């Protein structure tokens, strides 16, 4: 644990915890490929349980990066094609607005205005079919980006259909297991509940509730160790022995669309490195991140660029996560907290850390 890393991590994170009133936090820095871990505070305030390297946190939409890689793996397996019509995997989706909407559009939030959330009222699967059949696009496919659970969540559910596996089984067998992510879960087993931190929202202990497409869009929980290993795998996909998974990772980092200075991957989002920090910091604010923006198609997509800042923010009601890494520098960071605090503070802290080490 080189002093440089200790100092820049503590110097940045300590004031962040104080300003944001974060109950508990874990951080991993991957430096020259090796991880270094840091923890603070409480996984469970009431029971006085500290955050440790084994504490599980809700990753919220960092889960989209696993969905994107799992889709990538299914493409590499020849099970699906991003050019396939959505209706190929969901024949019951007969309404005319779906003509021309492909798995690519679903995966990348470009279908034409699918909403951020699946409505709470959608409880059953027939409820889900009804919702997509009745949905009216505001825009032609592949013209505008609108960040959306109903978009990538459906991509993840359709991507695994040819396998015949449930989404959770596919994720476990094809992604978590090969990568030795043995403490990463879509559903936290009872044996691991001791380690599951509470999230804190207005002072109240909370965990994410069940919802439609939850597993696919925001439902993964993980430890700081497994998340460092996730970053290592995404930094260096060529060390992964399972061919389709290596390829899936690279596909998730390809650049499909551009809006402003960001590129949309599958789950991952990327900018050219060196980045302008105001651009990623201000860009992470939900006033920008969640807004409808015109996109330019990248035809064909650019393969994973090593000189990139590759990142994803994640939140649930009680948790705030961030992952960012730079392949060409063998450098990355994971920040997991059990309070959903503002995105720009996450990115500001991550850039201050990675910049000092780069
Ligand atoms: B993502 O973190 O940007 C994201 C997560 N969610 C979410 C979290 C909990 C419940 C529900 Cl319904 C949605 N939306 C966006
Ligand atoms: O030659 B290109 O740069 C190229 C070839 N294939 N792709 C690509 C990228 C991402 C996803 C898919 Cl299905 C194909 C880019």
| Residue ranges covered by each domain of the chain | 1-358
Solved with: X-ray
**Using CA of residue 249, residue 237, residue 262, residue 331, what is the dihedral sign?**
positive
What is the H or E stretch that residue 149 is in? helix 149-159
- Tell which atom from ligand 2 comes closest to the C-alpha of 75: 13
267 CA distance to ligand 2 middle (Å): 16
Distance CA 80, CA 72 (A): 9
Residue 36 in marked binding region: no
Residue 61 in marked binding region: yes
CA 283 vs. chain centroid, Å, equals 16
Distance CA 185, CA 208 (A): 13
180 CA distance to ligand 1 middle (Å): 26
Ligand 2 pocket test target in 82, 254, 298 with most atoms within 8 Å of CB: 254
Resolution in A: 1.7
For the Cβ of 315 lying below 6 angstroms from any atom of ligand 1, the answer is yes
251 CA distance to ligand 2 middle (Å): 8
For 229-238, b/e burial (b = at least 16 CB within 10 A) is: bbbbbbbebe
Catalytic positions, please? 61
Distance CA 99, CA 117 (A): 22
Are the C-beta atoms of 263 and 248 separated by less than 8 Å? no
CATH number given to 1-358: 3.40.710.10
Distance CA 150, CA 317 (A): 18
Distance CA 81, CA 77 (A): 10
Half-sphere exposure for 308 (CA within 13 Å, toward CB): 24
Nearest CA to ligand 1 atom 7: 316
The count of other CB atoms within 10 Å of the CB of residue 287 is: 11
Distance CA 64, CA 348 (A): 22
- Tell which atom from ligand 2 comes closest to the C-alpha of 83: 13
For the Cβ of 117 lying below 6 angstroms from any atom of ligand 1, the answer is yes
Nearest CA to ligand 1 atom 8: 316
């Amino acid at each position: 644990a080189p002093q440089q890393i200790n100092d820049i991590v503590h110097r940045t994170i300590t004031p962040l915890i104080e300003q944001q009133k974060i109950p508990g936090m874990a951080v991993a820095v991957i430096y020259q490929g090796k991880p270094y871990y840091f923890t603070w505070g409480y996984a469970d305030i009431a029971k006085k349980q500290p955050v440790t390297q084994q504490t599980l946190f809700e990753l919220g939409s960092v889960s989209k990066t696993f969905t994107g890689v799992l889709g990538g793996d299914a493409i590499a397996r020849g099970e699906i094609k991003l050019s396939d019509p959505t209706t190929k995997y969901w024949p019951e989706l007969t309404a005319k607005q779906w003509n021309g909407i492909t798995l690519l559009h679903l995966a990348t939030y470009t279908a034409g205005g699918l909403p951020l959330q699946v409505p709470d009222e959608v409880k059953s699967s027939s409820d889900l079919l009804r919702f997509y059949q009745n949905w009216q696009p505001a825009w032609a496919p592949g013209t505008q980006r609108l960040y959306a659970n109903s978009s990538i969540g459906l991509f993840g559910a359709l991507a695994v259909k040819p396998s015949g596996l449930s989404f959770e089984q596919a994720m476990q067998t094809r992604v978590f297991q090969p990568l030795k992510l043995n403490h990463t879960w879509i559903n936290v087993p009872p044996a691991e509940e001791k380690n599951y931190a509470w999230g804190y929202r207005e002072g109240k202990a909370v965990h994410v509730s069940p919802g439609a497409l939850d597993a696919e869009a925001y439902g993964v929980k993980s430890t700081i160790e497994d998340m460092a290993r996730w970053v290592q795998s995404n930094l260096k996909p060529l060390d992964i022995n399972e061919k389709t998974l290596q390829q899936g990772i690279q596909l998730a980092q390809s650049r499909y669309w551009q809006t402003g200075d960001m590129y949309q991957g599958l789950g991952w989002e990327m900018l050219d490195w060196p980045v302008n920090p105001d651009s990623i910091i201000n860009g992470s604010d939900n006033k920008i991140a969640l807004a409808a923006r015109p996109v330019k198609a990248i035809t064909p997509p650019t393969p994973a660029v090593r000189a990139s800042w590759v990142h994803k923010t994640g939140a649930t009601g009680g948790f705030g996560s961030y992952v960012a890494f730079i392949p060409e520098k063998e450098l990355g960071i994971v920040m997991l907290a059990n309070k959903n605090y503002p995105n720009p503070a996450r990115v500001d802290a991550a850039w201050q850390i990675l910049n000092a080490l780069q």
